[PDB]
């Protein structure tokens, strides 16, 4: 989840 948020942004 953390990486999803980071990459999405």
Q: What is the resolution of this structure in A?
A: 0.8
**Chain centre distance of CA 4:** 3
- Label residue 5 exposed, middle or buried (CB < 10 Å: 0-12, 13-18, 19+): exposed
Token pair, residue 7, equals: 């990459």
* DSSP letters for the chain: -HHHHHHH-
Burial label, 7 (beta-carbon count in 10 A; 0-12, 13-18, 19+): exposed
- Structure solved via: X-ray
């Amino acid at each position: 989840l953390a990486a999803c948020l980071c990459q999405a942004l």
